[PDB]
Amino acid sequence: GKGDRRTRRGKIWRGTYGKYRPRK
Amino acid sequence: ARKALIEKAKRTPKFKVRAYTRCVRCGRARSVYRFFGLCRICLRELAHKGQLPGVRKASW
Amino acid sequence: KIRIKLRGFDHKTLDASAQKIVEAARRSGAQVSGPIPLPTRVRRFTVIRGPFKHKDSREHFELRTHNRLVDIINPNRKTIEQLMTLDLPTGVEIEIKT
Amino acid sequence: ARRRRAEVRQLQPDLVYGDVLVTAFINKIMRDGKKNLAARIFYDACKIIQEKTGQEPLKVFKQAVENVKPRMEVRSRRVGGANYQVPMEVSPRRQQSLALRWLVQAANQRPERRAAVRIAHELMDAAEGKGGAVKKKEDVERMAEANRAYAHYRW
Amino acid sequence: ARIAGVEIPRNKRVDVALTYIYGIGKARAKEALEKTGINPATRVKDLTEAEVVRLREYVENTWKLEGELRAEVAANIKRLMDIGCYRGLRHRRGLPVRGQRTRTNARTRKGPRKTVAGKK
Amino acid sequence: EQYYGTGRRKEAVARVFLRPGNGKVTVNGQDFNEYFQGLVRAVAALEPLRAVDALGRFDAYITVRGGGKSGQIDAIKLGIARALVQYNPDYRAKLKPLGFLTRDARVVERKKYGKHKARRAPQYSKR
Amino acid sequence: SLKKGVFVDDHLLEKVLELNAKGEKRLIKTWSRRSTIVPEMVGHTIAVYNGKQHVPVYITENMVGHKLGEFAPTRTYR
RNA sequence: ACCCCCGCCGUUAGUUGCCAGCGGUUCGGCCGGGCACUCUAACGGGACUGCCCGCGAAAGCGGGAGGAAGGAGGGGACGACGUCUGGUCAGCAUGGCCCUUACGGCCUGGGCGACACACGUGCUACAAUGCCCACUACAAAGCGAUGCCACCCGGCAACGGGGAGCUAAUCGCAAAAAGGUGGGCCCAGUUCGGAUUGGGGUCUGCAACCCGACCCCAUGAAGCCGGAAUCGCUAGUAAUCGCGGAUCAGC
RNA sequence: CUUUCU
Ligand SMILES: NC[C@@H]1O[C@H](O[C@H]2[C@@H](O)[C@H](O[C@@H]3[C@@H](O)[C@H](N)C[C@H](N)[C@H]3O[C@H]3O[C@H](CO)[C@@H](O)[C@H](O)[C@H]3N)O[C@@H]2CO)[C@H](N)[C@@H](O)[C@@H]1O
Ligand SMILES: [Mg+2]
Ligand SMILES: [Mg+2]
Ligand SMILES: [Mg+2]
Ligand SMILES: [Mg+2]
Ligand SMILES: [Mg+2]
Ligand SMILES: [Mg+2]
Ligand SMILES: [Mg+2]
Ligand SMILES: [Mg+2]
Ligand SMILES: [Mg+2]
Ligand SMILES: [Mg+2]
Q1: Tell me, what CATH number does G70's domain have?
Q2: N or C: which end of chain D has fewer CB within 10 A?
């Protein structure tokens, strides 16, 4: 999970934001 | 090299990203706290002496 | 109407310096919302003790900016005398606002 | 424990049936500090005891445990040459811990895909006397006693 | 049923099942399941021939896939051989391509391990 | 008209006001059961009431901010207890033996340098 | 990877453009491996420094998007 | 022991706290108003084996009450004479020896990033006590005017346009995540896992081939819990979940 | 248990 850029969790861990984790 | 270089790092350079920090005492590139211009070493030193104001042994 | 922020590294030279600004406005004027102590900004620095490799083993330093606040509501000129230049700043900061 | 004999960590009674032994179990169920999910499971499992029998869950669990407690075990032992398996009686604490340890390991060996179920069936099977827990146990009581020649150490 | 190249997804949800094509990930599946207006939850097993067509037509024509790709990608790397670029060697050598370390790791791109000798 | 206890447990503080009569409990402008929803542990926070038979012969209004929900629960547990002792000298005899009155000063211990985590040390090889 | 320029060294361009106005030279050597090969400035032979010497990289059409140093490999037997 | 942090209470203090009380509320402590409470930060109090039972010559030991807290309450800071000819002359300082159109200097470029291999420390896993998607306040240390960027709009997005507030308990980074509520997957090398690789982009920077991070499409490797060996942890610990900082253009 | 050498 945490290692997957295309999950939401992958994003969190990576600190990033994107399609798979939007800013509200 | 550490003389020709304490000198070079003060010169304003072509491109600001060639720029960098240096312990203004102990003339040194690495672990250089920007709030002081001070190398972790030449710093623990002053911090001990009382020559860094309000700075104190943290203990919590 | 008048607002004064007080910074400083030393907590005795605020609870002193700015608790004497409570007498130099109460005696020579009107109302004061007493000295109010603010959240302090702790800075912590963490240093490898030795000059060369001993990466576990460190020393821990903080640098603690204490903040205090005072508010005076009625601007007399009987007050802005001590509160103008009857000077005892020492190692203290002075912010003056309205 | 070189100095003292260690205080038996004393446990919050149960939120629901009011019993200490239950928290103990919920705790062995619990991973990574997730007491909530752990407790859902044990309660969800207690509800599966209801629907699949007119039995009160509490006294199923009680009596399952009582069936998984070993009487004797074999602790390994140096004899200035050889290590032998030495049979000896089992502290009431250790009875109780090993029981609940095995209940949950037994539970999680099962096929059923959902934790509350595995917990439930294993419990059922155990009160009856035929859970995987009880085999991992008659296995122990067997091995001690099948080493009864060395009962003349005990240390 | 059969969709592209020669693929036959089956029995599972379509969103999943589309994935079974070389060219379809979880994303391109969403795209083509609303651009044809098919509920994604429906199993392939039970989804209209009218739906299968809508789908099949969009897919084969919207973007390059299965086998066409397989040969394209292969031809990009062939192209990287050219007169002889850097990423060329790397593909030529069976070594990593994206600026990674090789002193350790790099196993995904290398023959399991080829252990040797050494030392006195 | 009013009853008060301040609860704390581990970064959580519990501002607790009891009232006479009904039985129902507000927490941060919310029913107890919709705030502590799903959280098995919650029924413990009111354990002080069941102790003295206050069951539901009081309402309660509670603000509770800080820390965490298991913490909040225990903070309350404490307020609720500190509240009704301050509305009955005699509510020690039942509430102290079960120590709903104790603070419980167990708190997150500090990350140390050298260590990974307070105590978890790093890992020897010696080879 | 950029999109507002191709960040190519003028000292090379300038020397290549003002060779294209009549210019078919091979003794064109550079140290700017960091510059993109620019729209069809092909045909020519640029020698690129790997940090030890210049290597003649013959520049053709298929390889235009790329950088120059992609053809001056810096390390030996890899 | 004398010092700092954390547990309980008191005093002093009201641009952070509040229907706690009552009033108005476009129902956001937002508005007049109020420090009660919470907190913030300064100063005090509090614990002494002082009190009760038992043992003891005594120190002290077991138990009990009161108390937020007992018998070192919990975490720091704090390292005897000395040991290792330990470590560092590459932080600095410094005795001696050696280089002085070079063992000094400046630059561009490459290298410190090599890869047939071996080891240490780590991350992500190998799944259903789980994975995915949506909704849903748990709260808790720090940073921010060559800065933190709310809010609008364009872009699937990274990011790009604009643009308010904040020298910051006032404004921003900030979503905490685990949890909770619903929905999906149904035990599959899988909707587990996210290596590798093709392609398209964004940003910092003179410049991202050798060498950056990020986003998006595609591609989905090994991996089904690990041989002999072997590591940490005794409680708010381990286990697990996110959050901040320093250095720093970016990483 | 086990331990020759260094
Ligand atoms: N000021 C020096 C610093 O102290 C550090 O802390 C060290 C010690 O003070 C600390 O304590 C030791 C521990 O080392 C050792 N392996 C086991 C022992 N039980 C610990 O002692 C423990 O108990 C004592 C007294 O009860 C405490 O005061 C002590 O700090 C605590 N860590 O553990 C650390 C080393 O294992 C480091 N020694 C050192 O890197 C650093 O220089
Ligand atoms: Mg995945
Ligand atoms: Mg730099
Ligand atoms: Mg380390
Ligand atoms: Mg922790
Ligand atoms: Mg080689
Ligand atoms: Mg030596
Ligand atoms: Mg150079
Ligand atoms: Mg290196
Ligand atoms: Mg499997
Ligand atoms: Mg010999």
Answers
A1: 3.30.860.10
A2: N
